[PDB]
Structure formats: structure tokens, C-alpha cells
From Swiss-Prot, chain A:
Protein name as it appears in the record: DNA replication licensing factor MCM2
Function: Acts as a component of the MCM2-7 complex (MCM complex) which is the putative replicative helicase essential for 'once per cell cycle' DNA replication initiation and elongation in eukaryotic cells. The active ATPase sites in the MCM2-7 ring are formed through the interaction surfaces of two neighboring subunits such that a critical structure of a conserved arginine finger motif is provided in trans relative to the ATP-binding site of the Walker A box of the adjacent subunit.
Quaternary organization: Component of the MCM2-7 complex. The complex forms a toroidal hexameric ring with the proposed subunit order MCM2-MCM6-MCM4-MCM7-MCM3-MCM5; loaded onto DNA, forms a head-head double hexamer.
Note, other: Present with 1690 molecules/cell in log phase SD medium.
Domain of life: Eukaryota
Subcellular location: Nucleus
Family to which the UniProt record says this protein belongs: Belongs to the MCM family.
Positions spanned in the full protein: 580 to 676 of 868
UniProtKB/Swiss-Prot annotation, chain B:
Locations listed in the record: Nucleus
Part of the intact protein present: 468 to 929 of 933
Protein residues bound to ATP: 73-80
Highest taxon above the source species: Eukaryota
The name this protein goes by in its record: DNA replication licensing factor MCM4
Span of domain MCM: 23-230
Known role: Acts as a component of the MCM2-7 complex (MCM complex) which is the putative replicative helicase essential for 'once per cell cycle' DNA replication initiation and elongation in eukaryotic cells. The active ATPase sites in the MCM2-7 ring are formed through the interaction surfaces of two neighboring subunits such that a critical structure of a conserved arginine finger motif is provided in trans relative to the ATP-binding site of the Walker A box of the adjacent subunit. The six ATPase active sites, however, are likely to contribute differentially to the complex helicase activity.
More details: Present with 8800 molecules/cell in log phase SD medium.
Stated family: Belongs to the MCM family.
Motif Arginine finger per record, residues: 205-208
Subunit structure: Component of the MCM2-7 complex. The complex forms a toroidal hexameric ring with the proposed subunit order MCM2-MCM6-MCM4-MCM7-MCM3-MCM5; loaded onto DNA, forms a head-head double hexamer.
The species this protein was found in: Saccharomyces cerevisiae (strain ATCC 204508 / S288c) (Baker's yeast)
Curated annotation (Swiss-Prot), chain C:
Location of Phosphothreonine modifications: 257
Quaternary state and interactors: Component of the MCM2-7 complex. The complex forms a toroidal hexameric ring with the proposed subunit order MCM2-MCM6-MCM4-MCM7-MCM3-MCM5; loaded onto DNA, forms a head-head double hexamer. Interacts with MCM10.
Function: Acts as a component of the MCM2-7 complex (MCM complex) which is the putative replicative helicase essential for 'once per cell cycle' DNA replication initiation and elongation in eukaryotic cells. The active ATPase sites in the MCM2-7 ring are formed through the interaction surfaces of two neighboring subunits such that a critical structure of a conserved arginine finger motif is provided in trans relative to the ATP-binding site of the Walker A box of the adjacent subunit. The six ATPase active sites, however, are likely to contribute differentially to the complex helicase activity.
Gene symbol of the encoding locus: MCM6
Residues of the full protein shown: 510 to 969 of 1017
Residues the record lists as binding ATP: 66-73
Residue spans crossing the bilayer: none
Protein name: DNA replication licensing factor MCM6
Compartments in which it is found: Nucleus
Curated annotation (Swiss-Prot), chain D:
Sequence positions that bind ATP 2: 86, 180
General function of this protein: Acts as a component of the MCM2-7 complex (MCM complex) which is the putative replicative helicase essential for 'once per cell cycle' DNA replication initiation and elongation in eukaryotic cells. Core component of CDC45-MCM-GINS (CMG) helicase, the molecular machine that unwinds template DNA during replication, and around which the replisome is built.
Naturally occurring in which organism (per UniProt): Saccharomyces cerevisiae (strain ATCC 204508 / S288c) (Baker's yeast)
Record-given protein name: DNA replication licensing factor MCM7
Location of this chain's protein in the cell: Cytoplasm; Nucleus
Gene from which the chain derives: MCM7
Other comments on record: Present with 166 molecules/cell in log phase SD medium. Early fractionation of eukaryotic MCM proteins yielded a variety of dimeric, trimeric and tetrameric complexes with unclear biological significance. Specifically a MCM467 subcomplex is shown to have in vitro helicase activity which is inhibited by the MCM2 subunit. The MCM2-7 hexamer is the proposed physiological active complex.
Length: 97, 400, 394, 222
DNA sequence: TTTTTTTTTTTTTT
């Protein structure tokens, strides 16, 4: 949510998901995602919406996006001869999602 | 009006000063009137303003005359005085400190015009230095984004700005001298030199020289220095502003050439230097062609590179006394991977506590180092994929 | 104009293949094969088709490595000092974005001003960096978007975007030991990930060492470079005529549809039959992409020889040419048993006798077996089988 | 354009507290002002270096919450190591409880609010006007060192250049009794002479600075 | 018949 030029209150910019409603959002390389922007991923697949933080306006949205996750294995080629839970860096809460 | 075209008759007064034998020493002692001894510094810095010559080829080239020089030693050497001096003599001067330098700091701040409300490209402290000489304090202490403008102009000898509205990659070429201190600030007796110079020897590979000041407690030094500072107080040939006009004439109007003669010496010495690198020899001409830009010689003397090589040896005589010792972290890693192996054999798990590891390291022998550097060697295994952390309480061993 | 009549004269010779080689960077001495790729980099690939669906590569890529003092950087200024639209920065500080967009906020006044940044005019060009150690890991794969998609979208929570990046990225890191590290599989040699690593093909290692003759030859030719004079030693090709030859060689769209690409299969098959073991070897795999790479080599080989449709010889060049720098990386119960029965000797009977006792071959094996097996049961058939095949061959 | 501080009153003392909280904004500039005789400005369109002839003094407030006696010198201080050889001399002020002096202290704190005038038995305060005129009478004097005292400034300074060095590792430190402490010691007798008038610079006129030399340091013990 | 306006709050960012 960004305040527009000169005198205007804050306009709300949709997360690209809003652009993707009824459609599908595509991601690759989860090793490269910060733990910051990744939080809200876990949101959409639960409510089918987004609820952010900034700032001055109570809202809700609608996110119908399907999600394609592509991510390279921890390190190189095949990682867990041990359980694949040993493979992913990402937390299981966002995984089983 | 204020708070230079050369006259003709003092030009042959220049050549008169050229037939004078000690101009190599003389002008140097005229460089830094304030400072006692350290004559190799006045020597070098003399050759610094006479530094190099332009090679434009057909294309590419542009190795210039540009010479960086580091100097350091016992803390506060009166290095900052020679910096604050030479800084002022220069057509375009530059000076700052360590920690007072960074990547973002010296190039193209591209600020708004403010009062006319228009963003206009600004030259950073490096663009203005283009030509002439930069100076800074304590390269051991420079930040991490510091050296990021250095890695940029040392060789590229340019700067790249594409951001905002306008795109220019514009050139910066100037010789430079940064003052510094050993980590001690005494670098301590004996010891390997590289770590003692701080920094890795790979980063030091580039810098054209290493100047090490030290403290002899000669008596006989500090009283002889005192007797220097004993003056003023109250109230030897030393030209003042005659050297400057000679700095103007001796640079463009001379176009020195190595001839054939250069090679027989400049080459053969380099084998024993090597027995050095192609970066030292890179300037083995540059420093000697700075002895070429001296004397008004358009064809340079075969015997200069003796004391040019000697100016290189000066850094090398500082090496007479870590990453430059060969194996090091690697021999430690043979015994690391062997300790991890033999634990993997003895212990039923691929993992062992880093503690049990260091108990198996630092104590057994003394080529077995301290915990954090064992952890830098296992970092060097980790960055090799040759270890696995398995929680921050223990250490796993690499697996199929 | 009339300078193609220069080019006909140049496209006659057999020898202009080796000529184009010794004619590229005089500022560099030796190093040979790596030179080729540089040219072959300026030279374009297919970078097109086959529908429907994604555009295949295309392009080519090189990260040249070796001990500092290598004088590899002399290649890089040669990129920018020769090639068209060359973008070059070695720095850690771009920053991040960088080749990525910032995105600049506040502009001010509504903001979201999208920086290029960096690689913009770099598009359709040869991009260069130094010292991957000094770009760290954060941005490693974020500049790798263009190394697969060939285009890079850029996200700060700015406005949704994607950018045309299509470019070769050539560079040189200094090895993380500063040297070889012979033993280092180039995978752990780099301190970087296979997705961005396997993608740049191929690296082409050069270690720079002293040798007494060579110390005098570096004291010969490198000296002649040190020389202001004689700098009069010349390449067989005038640089600018090499450039106009490229601007001519950039017109070609050479394609091997030729059925002798069947040979490229066997070759590529036998490309991975060797890397098959170890998987800690040159592998990689080597990557399915290295077949595409195998192709994108002869793409430029064709612009080199100016004829199209390529040949078995042409790809043979490139295949072996990979093969060195993949070799620069070099230094079902009983299927695990006949694996290591001939494998223990594979790593050891060449480097030693392959002797002593039968069961010692078991004991270093209880080391590496336990870590990739998936149970206590899969541990025991790594025990009693290392017993059972011993009394099988005893 | 308004230069503050180092510009505002020049050829006069600058008085600082919270000197470690000056950030780096003041730090590098004053880091120049120990080379004195300048302040450079490249900001905006103005490239001048304007005179800061300012004298420097600071009250150094060490990091929280007090300096620790076991700790090596410079540990308490958060300033750069290069900036403390730039001052001539420094006095460390430790507040150590003494069941004696804290008595007269607390009686000194209780002399307020009982009275207004604190001192007695006895001193008569010396007022600024009349004092300032001798202090401005002195700067005109301009002493010139005799050579005897000069050579003496060399000799004991050799063992001063030895005991800070022969103590080697920092521990107490700092060495080296660098040139600036001799520079200083000399300028301090040049300062001390005008307190005598003279211009002849007595041997003990040097020695009085010599008493302050170590007294500055070595307070790091208690 | 027209007049005249840059801090403070929050934000996303290396």
C-alpha cells in the first residue's frame, strides 16, 4: 500500500497474486527466497486471499491462484538418501501446504 | 584575483639540474623537508610523480603510468604528514581515512540540483582524482564495500555508471598512495609477512609495492630524529618550486623508450625474483620507465632498473621477516578429513561434536589450530561440500 | 561494400581457422583453446525455436579459472576492448540490483521507478564479471534467471515485470584456494551451485605455473608485451577486419540437420558413459543441457568455418574441447557388490597395487556405505554382502 | 553557509563531551583537525578548505557504564586507535570510593543547598578578566628554547622512547611516547614558559611538563 | 479578480 502523489490517502497495490486471480502463480528456486517474502506464500493457499500489514486501511482480498513450486535440491543433485525431510531447507509447515 | 606557462630560460636550468648528479636523491630530499630518514619513501614518491608512460597501441592497452603504493609501519609514522603534503602539491589531489571509505562513497552520487529541482550527475572523489594522485589511511581497515571501488579502477582503470536516467562508463587514471598500519600496530618480529600485512596475499598480489616502516630503537635514531625535530625550535641543496615546473615538463614532453638494452637485465632479474609475479614485473618497467620519465631521457638508461628492482625488493626486503604458505588449511584438512574419517569409522554416526573435533585437533600437535580457524577449514570443507552441519550443536560428515 | 572482397580472400583458406585463433588477443600468451570460445562467444548460436513452447539455447558460456597472476583478466578487457555493446563489472557492489531492477522508491511522487539496472544495454551482448567469490552467493542464481529463461523478471514488491536479458555471460573467478586444488572437483572448486554452474559451459580451467624455459618465455613474450617496443609484433588479422568479419559471420544461421548428428548422439552418449562414475566426478551428470551445449558449440564452430550444416569433425572439436575442461574437473544386491568389486580397484588399482587382504576392502566401505543406505537392514546387506561376495570371489 | 564549532570560534578552544557519540560525521574531519590548520569541504559546489585554527578539548565519556580497571586501555574508549595519538595528553578520571574523600565530598554536596558560596579555609577565586589579560599577555611572549634544555628534551625522551617500548606488548601501553608527545612536551614548555614569561625556557620549565607526561597515564592502574 | 503549501508518518529496501 503506497500513498499516491501530492494530497491523496494510501492506494492499495495488489500482490502479483491479485493479477493472477483464477489463474496460476509460478515460482522457481526456493533456495533463493528470503524468509521475509516467503511468509505470505503460506497465506494464499490457506484463505485464498492476502492480508498484509501496511498501513492505514482494513481490507481483505481474493486470491484464487494455483501455485507451481520449483526449487533446486539443497546443495547439488540428489540430497537425502536419508529421509527427504532431510532434503528441503523450507519448513514442513509450508511444505505440506 | 586568487587567494602556469613555463618560462624558457629555466628550462635549460632544468637540464642544468639534470646534469646535477644527485637529482634522484636531491629532489627527493626536497620532496619531504619535514621528515627524517625513510629515504626509499622520498625515492619512490619522487618516481611517483614521474610515474610511467602511456601505451595506446593500435587499440586496447592504456596501462598508463598509474602507480599505487602502500606504506605502513609503527602507528602514526608521520605518514599522514607526507600524505597531507603531497596531497597539496598535486594538480588533482585526493585524501581520506580507513572506515571513511566504501564502495558507494567515492563515485557518482548523482544528486538533484536542489534549487533548480533537477537531478544532475555528480563526480565522486575518484572521478576528480582522474589524473594526479589519491591518498588514504589503513587499507587493512577499509570496509568490505571499500576495495569494491578499488577492484574497479586498479585494472579497468574506468568506472561504470548506468543508473537513473543517463549512462556513462567514464575513465579514472591516477597514481595513488595510501598510508596504513600493521594489525599490531606493531607487526611483531619474525612471523610470516602476509597475515602480518593483514589481508590475504591474493588481494596483496595487485598492489604495486609494500612499504614497511619499523622501529629500531637506535639511539642514534631517535636522538638523530630528535636533532631533526630539534629544529623549529629556530628559526644542503633543496629546490622549491623549480621541481614542480619540471614535473610539468618531464611528463608529456618526454616520451621514454626501453630500447633493446632493458631486456637483458629487466628480464634476467625476474627469474630470481620469481625464484615474485607478473604483477611485480608488470611495473618492473613502470617503475623503471618512471626512472625513464626522469632525467628527460627519451631513450632510457639500461642501468636504472637496478634500483627499480631495488624498489621492488624494498617490499621484498619487508618479506624477509598465511594464505601464501601453500597447504596450511589444506594439511590441516588432510588431518581434518582424516579425523572425520577415522571418527566416522570409530563413531557409529557420520557426525561428531565440533568440540570432540577440536579436542582431536589443537591438543595433539601444534599444526593443529584453534577452534574458529578449524571451523574456517571446515568452512573451506563446507564451501567444498566436504562437511555437513547437522544442527549447530554438532558436525556431520559428508556422505554419498 | 568492398571489404567482403577482403572476406572472400579470408574465407578461402583452411588456415583462417587457426589464424582466427592466433589473431585474437596478443596481450595474452599461450592459453590456446580458451581463446577460441571467446570468439565463439562473440559469435552467435541458434538461440531459437523449436516452438511451441519454449525457445531453446542458444548462446554459449565460459567461466575461466586459475591461480591469480594468471593474466586471465587480459581476456576481459579484450572483451570490452573488442566486442560490441560490452558491459563489464567485476564488483560485489552493483548492488544485487544490479542487473536486477532496484526498484527505486521513493521516486519521489508515487515512486516505483524501475531501475534497469546494470545489464540493460548488455542485452544481446557479452557480459563479464570477475571473482565469483566477490559476488558471493546471494545474487548467484538471481543473475541466473537469464541463464535459463534468458530473461529476468525483477521483484522487490515493485510492479510486476519481466526483462529481455538474452546474453552470454563470461567471467573469471579466482579459485577458492587461489590455486589448484587439483583434487578439487570443479563443483566444490567454485563455491557455487550446479544450477548456475552446470549452466555456464564450459568453464575451461587454466592453472598458471612457473617452468624454467617457460620462465624465460614469459621472460620472452610477456616481456614483448611489457615492451613498449617492440610492440610491433602483429596478429595475422587486423583487429577491425576481424570485427567486420564477425559482422559478416553474424549473418550466418548455420544449422546441422545433417544425419551425421547421429554421431553426436553416440558422442554425447559416450559423453556420459564415462562421467557415469563417479557421480562426484566431472558430474554434474554431465548435464542434459550439455547436449544442448554440445550443439551450441558447433553453432559457433560453423561461423568460424563459415560453411553451414557443420560436420562430424566440427563437433568433434567442440566435444573434445569440453572434454578437457570436464577433465580439468577430473584429477541389485550384487549390483552394489560388482559395483565396488571393480570400483574399489577403479579408484585404487591404478593409484596403487589393489592388494593386501580381502576384508580391508570391506572396512573403508563400512564408512561410505552407512551414510547413503536407508535402514539398519540396508546396512546389513552392506555387511553380509561384503562378506558374501568375498567368499564368492574367494 | 554556516560552519559550526571548528569554524565558529577559531584560534580558540573547542570543548567536547559525548565525544564518542560524535559518530563518524565529526570523527574524520576532526581526524583532520589534528593535522590542524584546515577543514576541507567538497560538498555542493564549494571546494574550499577553511581554517579551523580551533583548539581541541573533549570530555571523554567511556562506554557503559564505567571503565573497568582490569581491562586494557583503549578498551573503555570506543574511539579509533589512530585518533588518540593525535591528542597530546589525556587525563583519565576514575571515581573510586574512599571513606575519606567521599566524606568531604558529601559535605561538599551538602554545602549545597545550605549555602551558595562553596569554598573556604581558604582560597580567593581568581576572576576571568584580570586572569585572561595575563593569559593574553603570555601568548605574545613567544619563548625560544635554549639548547641545553633542548638536548635534555632529547635525553630523558630516549628512555621515554624506551620504557613505553621496552614494555612491549600493550598491557598498560600506549607507547611509543611518539613524536607528538615530544612535539607536545616542547609546546608544553613553550606553554609553560609564558606562565613564567622568561622566553629562556628553564630546564625545570621542561621538567614541569615532564611531570605531567606520565601522570596523564599510569592513572590507568587504580 | 486571484491570492497560497514542506514535516511526519509510514513504507519497502539494500
Amino acid at each position: 500500500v503506497r500513498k499516491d502523489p501530492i494530497t491523496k490517502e494510501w492506494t492499495l497495490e495488489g500482490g502479483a497474486l491479485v493479477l493472477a486471480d483464477k489463474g496460476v502463480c509460478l515460482i522457481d528456486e526456493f533456495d533463493k527466497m528470503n524468509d521475509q517474502d516467503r511468509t505470505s506464500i503460506h497465506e494464499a493457499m490457506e484463505q485464498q486471499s492476502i492480508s498484509i500489514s501496511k498501513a492505514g486501511i482494513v481490507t481483505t482480498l481474493q486470491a484464487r491462484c494455483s501455485i507451481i513450486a520449483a526449487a533446486n535440491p539443497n546443495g547439488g543433485r540428489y540430497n537425502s538418501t536419508l529421509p527427504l525431510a532431510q532434503n528441503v531447507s523450507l519448513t514442513e509447515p509450508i511444505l505440506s501446504r | 584575483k586568487v587567494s602556469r606557462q613555463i618560462t624558457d630560460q629555466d628550462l635549460a636550468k632544468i637540464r642544468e639540474v639534470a646534469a646535477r648528479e644527485d637529482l634522484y636523491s636531491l629532489l627527493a630530499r626536497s620532496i619531504a623537508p619535514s621528515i627524517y630518514e625513510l629515504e626509499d619513501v622520498k625515492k619512490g614518491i619522487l618516481l611517483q610523480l614521474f610515474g610511467g608512460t602511456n601505451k595506446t597501441f593500435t587499440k586496447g592497452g592504456r596501462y598508463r603510468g598509474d602507480i599505487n603504493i602502500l606504506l605502513c609501519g609503527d602507528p602514526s609514522t608521520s605518514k599522514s604528514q607526507i600524505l597531507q603534503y603531497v596531497h597539496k602539491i598535486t594538480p588533482r589531489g585526493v585524501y581520506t581515512s580507513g572506515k571513511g571509505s566504501s564502495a558507494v562513497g567515492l563515485t557518482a552520487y548523482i544528486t538533484r540540483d536542489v534549487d533548480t529541482k533537477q537531478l544532475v550527475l555528480e563526480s565522486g572523489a575518484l572521478v576528480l582524482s582522474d589524473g594526479g594522485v589519491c591518498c588514504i589511511d589503513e587499507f587493512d581497515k577499509m570496509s568490505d564495500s571499500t576495495r569494491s571501488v578499488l577492484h574497479e579502477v586498479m585494472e579497468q582503470q574506468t568506472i561504470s555508471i548506468a543508473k537513473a536516467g543517463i549512462i556513462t562508463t567514464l575513465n579514472a587514471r591516477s597514481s595513488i598512495l595510501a598510508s596504513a598500519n600493521p594489525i599490531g600496530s606493531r607487526y611483531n618480529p619474525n612471523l610470516p609477512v602476509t597475515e602480518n600485512i593483514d589481508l590475504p596475499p591474493p588481494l596483496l598480489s595487485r598492489f604495486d609495492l609494500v612499504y614497511l616502516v619499523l622501529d629500531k630503537v637506535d639511539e642514534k635514531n631517535d636522538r638523530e630524529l630528535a636533532k631533526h625535530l630539534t629544529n623549529l625550535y629556530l628559526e644542503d641543496v633543496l629546490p622549491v618550486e623549480f621541481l614542480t615546473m619540471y614535473i610539468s615538463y618531464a611528463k608529456e614532453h618526454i616520451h621514454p623508450i626501453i630500447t633493446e638494452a632493458a631486456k637483458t637485465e629487466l628480464v634476467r632479474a625476474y627469474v630470481g625474483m620469481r625464484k615474485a609475479t607478473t604483477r611485480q614485473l608488470e611495473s618492473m618497467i613502470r617503475l623503471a620507465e618512471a626512472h625513464a620519465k626522469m632525467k628527460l631521457k627519451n631513450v632510457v638508461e639500461l642501468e636504472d632498473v637496478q634500483e627499480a628492482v631495488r624498489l621492488i625488493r624494498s617490499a621484498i626486503k619487508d618479506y624477509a621477516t598465511q594464505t601464501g604458505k601453500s597447504v596450511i588449511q589444506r594439511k590441516l584438512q588432510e588431518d581434518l578429513s582424516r579425523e572425520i574419517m577415522n571418527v566416522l569409522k570409530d563413531q557409529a554416526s557420520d557426525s561428531m561434536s565440533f568440540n570432540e573435533l577440536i579436542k582431536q585437533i589443537n591438543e595433539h600437535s601444534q599444526d593443529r589450530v584453534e577452534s574458529s580457524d578449524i571451523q574456517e577449514a571446515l568452512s573451506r570443507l563446507q564451501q567444498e561440500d566436504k562437511v555437513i552441519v547437522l544442527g549447530e550443536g554438532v558436525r556431520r560428515s559428508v556422505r554419498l | 561494400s568492398d571489404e567482403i572482397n577482403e572476406l572472400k580472400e579470408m574465407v578461402k583458406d583452411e588456415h583462417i581457422y587457426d589464424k582466427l585463433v592466433r589473431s585474437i588477443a596478443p596481450a595474452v600468451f599461450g592459453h590456446e583453446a580458451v581463446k577460441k570460445g571467446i570468439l565463439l562467444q562473440m559469435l552467435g548460436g541458434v538461440h531459437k525455436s523449436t516452438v511451441e513452447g519454449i525457445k531453446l539455447r542458444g548462446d554459449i558460456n565460459i567461466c575461466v579459472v586459475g591461480d591469480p597472476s594468471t593474466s586471465k583478466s587480459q581476456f576481459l578487457k579484450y572483451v570490452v576492448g573488442f566486442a560490441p555493446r560490452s558491459v563489464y563489472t567485476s564488483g560485489k557492489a552493483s548492488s544485487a540490483a544490479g542487473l536486477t531492477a532496484a526498484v527505486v522508491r521513493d521516486e519521489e511522487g508515487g515512486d516505483y521507478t524501475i531501475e534497469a539496472g546494470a545489464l540493460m544495454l548488455a542485452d544481446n551482448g557479452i557480459c563479464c564479471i570477475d571473482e565469483f567469490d566477490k559476488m558471493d552467493i546471494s545474487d548467484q542464481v538471481a543473475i541466473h534467471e537469464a541463464m535459463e529463461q534468458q530473461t529476468i523478471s525483477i521483484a522487490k514488491a515493485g510492479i510486476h515485470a519481466t526483462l529481455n536479458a538474452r546474453t552470454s555471460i563470461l567471467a573469471a573467478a579466482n579459485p577458492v584456494g587461489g590455486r589448484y586444488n587439483r583434487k578439487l572437483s570443479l563443483r566444490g572448486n567454485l563455491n557455487m551451485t550446479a544450477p548456475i554452474m552446470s549452466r555456464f559451459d564450459l568453464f575451461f580451467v587454466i592453472l598458471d605455473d612457473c617452468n624454467e624455459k617457460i620462465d624465460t618465455e614469459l621472460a620472452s613474450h610477456i616481456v614483448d608485451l611489457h615492451m613498449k617496443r617492440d610492440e610491433a609484433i602483429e596478429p595475422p588479422f587486423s583487429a577491425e577486419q576481424l570485427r567486420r568479419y564477425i559482422k559478416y559471420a553474424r549473418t550466418f544461421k548455420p544449422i546441422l540437420t545433417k544425419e551425421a548428428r547421429s554421431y553426436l548422439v553416440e558422442k554425447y552418449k559416450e559423453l556420459r558413459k564415462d562421467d557415469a562414475q563417479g557421480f562426484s566426478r566431472s558430474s554434474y551428470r554431465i548435464t542434459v543441457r550439455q547436449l544442448e551445449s554440445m550443439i551450441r558449440l558447433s553453432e559457433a564452430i560453423a561461423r568460424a568455418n563459415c560453411v553451414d550444416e557443420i560436420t562430424p569433425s566440427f563437433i568433434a572439436e567442440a566435444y573434445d574441447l569440453l572434454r578437457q575442461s570436464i577433465i580439468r574437473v577430473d584429477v541389485d544386491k550384487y549390483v552394489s557388490m560388482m559395483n565396488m568389486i571393480v570400483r574399489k580397484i577403479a579408484e585404487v588399482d591404478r593409484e596403487g597395487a589393489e592388494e593386501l587382504t580381502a576384508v580391508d576392502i570391506v572396512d573403508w566401505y563400512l564408512l561410505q556405505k552407512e551414510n547413503d543406505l536407508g535402514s539398519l537392514a540396508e546396512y546389513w546387506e552392506e555387511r553380509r554382502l561384503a562378506f558374501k561376495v568375498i567368499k564368492r570371489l574367494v | 553557509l554556516e560552519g559550526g564549532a571548528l569554524v565558529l570560534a577559531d584560534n580558540g578552544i573547542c570543548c567536547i563531551d559525548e565525544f564518542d557519540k560524535m559518530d563518524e560525521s565529526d570523527r574524520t574531519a576532526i581526524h583532520e583537525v589534528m593535522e590542524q590548520q584546515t577543514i576541507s569541504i567538497s560538498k555542493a559546489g564549494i571546494n574550499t578548505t577553511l581554517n579551523a585554527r580551533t583548539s581541541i578539548l573533549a570530555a571523554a565519556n567511556p562506554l557503559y557504564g564505567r571503565y573497568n580497571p582490569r581491562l586494557s586501555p583503549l578498551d573503555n574508549i570506543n574511539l579509533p586507535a589512530a585518533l588518540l595519538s593525535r591528542f597530546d595528553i589525556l587525563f583519565l578520571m576514575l571515581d573510586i570510593p574512599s571513606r575519606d574523600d567521599d566524606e568531604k565530598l558529601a559535605e561538599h554536596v551538602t554545602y549545597v543547598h545550605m549555602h551558595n558560596k562553596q569554598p573556604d579555609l581558604d582560597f580567593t577565586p581568581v576572576e576571568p578578566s584580570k586572569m585572561r589579560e595575563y593569559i593574553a599577555y603570555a601568548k605574545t611572549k613567544r619563548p625560544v628554547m635554549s639548547e641545553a634544555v633542548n638536548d635534555y628534551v632529547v635525553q630523558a625522551y630516549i628512555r621515554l622512547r624506551q620504557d613505553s617500548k621496552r614494555e612491549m606488548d600493550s598491557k598498560f601501553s600506549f607507547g611509543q611516547a611518539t613524536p607528538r608527545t615530544l612535539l607536545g612536551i616542547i609546546r608544553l614548555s613553550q606553554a609553560l614558559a609564558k606562565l613564567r614569561l622568561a622566553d629562556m625556557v628553564d630546564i625545570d620549565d621542561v621538567e614541569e611538563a615532564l611531570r605531567l607526561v606520565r601522570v596523564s597515564k599510569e592513572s590507568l592502574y587504580q
